[PDB]
Amino acid sequence: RYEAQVRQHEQEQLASTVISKVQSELQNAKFQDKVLAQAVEEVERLFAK
Amino acid sequence: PTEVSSILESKIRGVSDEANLDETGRVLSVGDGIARVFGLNNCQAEELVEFASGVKGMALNLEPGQVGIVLFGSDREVKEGEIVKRTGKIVDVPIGPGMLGRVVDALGNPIDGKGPIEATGYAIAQLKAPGILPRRSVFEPMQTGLKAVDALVPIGRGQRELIIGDRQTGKTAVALDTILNQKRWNDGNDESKKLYCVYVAVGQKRSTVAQLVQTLEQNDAMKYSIVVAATASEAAPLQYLAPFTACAIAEWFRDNGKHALIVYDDLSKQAVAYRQLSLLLRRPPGREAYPGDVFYLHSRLLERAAKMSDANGGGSLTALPVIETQGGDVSAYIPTNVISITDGQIFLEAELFYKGIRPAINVGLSVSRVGSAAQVKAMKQVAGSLKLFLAQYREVAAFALDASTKQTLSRGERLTQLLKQKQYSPQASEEQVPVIYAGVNGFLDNIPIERIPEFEEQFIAYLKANEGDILEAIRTKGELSSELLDKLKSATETFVAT
Amino acid sequence: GPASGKIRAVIGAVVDVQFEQGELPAILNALTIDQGNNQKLVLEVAQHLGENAVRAIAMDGTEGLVRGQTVVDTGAPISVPVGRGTLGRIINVVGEPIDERGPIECKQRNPIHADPPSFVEQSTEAEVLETGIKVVDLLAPYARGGKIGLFGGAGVGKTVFIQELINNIAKAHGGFSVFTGVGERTREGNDLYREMKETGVINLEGESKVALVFGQMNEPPGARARVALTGLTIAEYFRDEEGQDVLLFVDNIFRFTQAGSEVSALLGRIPSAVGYQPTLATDMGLLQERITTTRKGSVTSVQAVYVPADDLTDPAPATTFAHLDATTVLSRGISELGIYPAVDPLDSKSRLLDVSVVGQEHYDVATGVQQTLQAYKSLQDIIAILGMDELSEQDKLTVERARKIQRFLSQPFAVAEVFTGIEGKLVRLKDTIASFKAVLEGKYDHLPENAFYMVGGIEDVVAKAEKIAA
Amino acid sequence: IKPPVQLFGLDGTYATALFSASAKDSSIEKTFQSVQKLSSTISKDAKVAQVLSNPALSLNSRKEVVSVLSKELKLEPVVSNLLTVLAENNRLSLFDSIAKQFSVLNDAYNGVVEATVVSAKPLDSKILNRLTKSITNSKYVGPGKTLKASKVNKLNKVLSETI
């Protein structure tokens, strides 16, 4: 029970730090995220046409 | 094993690739457990929907320009102007052999924390029952473990036995003892004698559902039993659809070649949840503030639990509905509708339950339609006229010293105390046939009234060491001929004098 | 091409069809909808909402229909097979066979919606019908060619009363039978077909004389309400076009009014008493008037009514009592005492209970037995509180004779041999009148009360008292 | 003639009923400019909107007497019959719903919609929406697109719920 609680606390603490780093990277004006979001919309509409 | 978190992150990276094809539109208003969706022209009737916050919905009425969607969750997860999502299918749930050992909910999602359920298909909740060509007579025996249920009103595979009664009388206790008594046949290799339980707790509290699942796992009974958790703290659509979702999962075993036992606890809680959603949609309330389709909701779900023929697989489905009466009123609106569709009932009076007679099974009220031919031949031969002698002894004792009345009062008191078992103490067919044969032949009249509990434990232990050939023949063959009847009378007479 | 429509609204059993052309369908019109299972669908028109749109009622499940589906009109009502080809087969509400024995090769197909007989085509009679029970051949006697009602609650004895009368009257009637079950159980339909084939009623490889109509409570509301019209159309053709004494057996008759009340709220109608439909007396009178005896043939209707939560003052039980010649009310209080069945003598009444049809001897025995039971029931407040010792000399003898007369009329049926354990007793009309007159005169006052319970006539009461005293 | 656009059934049937008689002899282009003048002189003016919420009037300034409220405005053909039906049936309070439903009929049979993300779409007037959406998505992604979203928020919430 102590080994499972230590593994669950380490996985929950590591997931909280990775979620905070992903939100801070998107607020720093990512130039690669803006170009990839526009190209994904044109490729999805052409496959269903 | 070697970074287990890296295996789940790689498989969940690429999944969303095509989910932008109009489909559903948006909503307009929401309230009283409903959601007036504006649009969705391609949505069919009784189809599954999804809100923007993740709440499921069911499009009931679809008029021109609007569509009435019934939310299965809270009203705070749907607002005005939120986009909807059409699933494309109807109200279905998961089924198959992989659901044995997990506690599912109303929509089929696991709530026990054991991960996903390995389902082998997807069956709809609103399924039609079989006709007269794919049905057969009930002939298999359903052992419940109780001595007063296996001899009076016995149950069979494919029949519907109701369990009426008041609160704190023995309604939920009769269904829990029948599921735990099937461990002697499900742990072996006989697939025809096994019966998968299906507990559908609808209307119960949150603490009562967690305590009942822990008691079945400690006695090796939760490995082959489906648990449908449906508390009263959820929406009104989740509790009303708990009866239809539990019947679809148990129907897969009857259509393939296995037996199933469904326990809808309780039937009175399901009628109150269906009336809440109908009263908010501006409907007509009939008797006891119920709609016109109150009798059709319980008759359609109970008609599917029938016994199939040899050309359909040979399986059957047993239904055990518990009716919660209000002060013993068996002539109510919800009480008369369940008794007219089931083949027998088990009345639980609150007067005999407080005196020590557990369970309080009335012989003059509870009966079984297809319970005579769907019983064991060894228990029916030893209990000759057991149902007729139990009802006549209760009426004579309530009005009472003659010579004829003294013989019926002494024999009737010993038979009622010996058939009353404790909680979580089920007996087999071989042990109950030896105890019922001594009380009907006059072998227990010389014993005292307080020694009725001590005589049952002493006779069962002596018959399993000094006469093992007579106990094994009654369970394998299931009947007793001339040689088996003479050996049982000689062993009971020698043990009663010592 | 036929008249095609488009589905505009769908709320349960009600499906509004919007026709694009000006030729809209009429009322009670069969509408077909294309699906994907080699069966299509069935829909009956109810009313018209206007603006080239009529509200129809589907006869099956409406799950899977989208807004804008093609709905073709057949041009007429829901037709069913009639004649001698429907005998022995299990038909449905739309006339299709459900017995898996091929299609019904019928010459003509009459509709389910038809008018009843007029006042000039009616034919009244007063022929008594012997059933075999001791409580029915003396109290409320049934009439040949009339409507019989078996009212009762849940678990009283409504299904067992219709099964015992069909095995001792319909087996030697000569004419064809019509067992149309509406709102029954799933196990009751399979058990009734297997028992009739082993006795010589429904022969699959020979000649049959009993029409079976499916329609349990597992279907939708449109199939349960239309189950009574499909079964009555086959029995009406055998008495008018052929001239035969048909026997209509409905089980139960209360399911026809309860199925229409659930769909009346979605059609625009306001609710009535106890949440029922406003056209309760108009819908029940149009179907009960067509199952009567005419000049071409008779029709003995033996339906059974269901009491709502043990209440005879409901809107579905009190409205059906004015369209039956003989009634058989089954009380729930007498069923728990040991009466088989619970034939209440103070509530059962018939029109054939007179001295001009049963004779002067049978009329005096019926009035004397009913007068003794009414005196003991009115004095039940003093016997249950003070006791039986508070009565006088005249009241003490009447209380003992009333208890033995109530148990003597309860005879064990042949179909209930597995639940009672005794054999089936079928007393005649002449033996039941002679046994009741001798017990009321003082010739059987020395016998016990248990010697007459679950017996036959005067011969079975004397043999049971001698065996219990030995 | 009924076009497949549904548009409710009770409140949206006001503009759909008058569109059948106005679609003859080419009388659909003049109805678009005449319907915009009736709503712009009864909303942002605060002068002729004195009887918009009151239940009085009763044939005093709504119908019959108009002159400057019909001839001097922009009504001469079938535009005068649309305001007379709303005054007798007490439907002058919802003038914005009748004018908005008339513009949706011309944009459905002679145009397109289906907005993807960010702002509006292109609203072509070719034929099918298969070849029109693929040729307009590549020309609009390069030109403009400030990106100041929906797909990035859904993927981040699914990873935190499985922790």
Ligand SMILES: Nc1ncnc2c1ncn2[C@@H]1O[C@H](COP(=O)(O)OP(=O)(O)O)[C@@H](O)[C@H]1O
């Ligand atoms: N065989 C038995 N011996 C002793 N007590 C019993 C037995 N069967 C049931 N009980 C008691 O009856 C109670 C039933 O509780 P519950 O299930 O909540 O009400 P209901 O039975 O009306 O659903 C239990 O608390 C249990 O202690």
Ligand SMILES: Nc1ncnc2c1ncn2[C@@H]1O[C@H](COP(=O)(O)OP(=O)(O)O)[C@@H](O)[C@H]1O
């Ligand atoms: N003649 C009889 N003797 C003993 N029991 C009977 C007799 N007739 C009916 N019963 C009992 O009445 C019950 C009726 O059950 P069911 O048909 O389900 O309800 P209902 O009669 O209200 O339709 C049966 O279980 C049967 O045991």
Ligand SMILES: [Mg+2]
């Ligand atoms: Mg309980």
Ligand SMILES: [Mg+2]
């Ligand atoms: Mg019945």
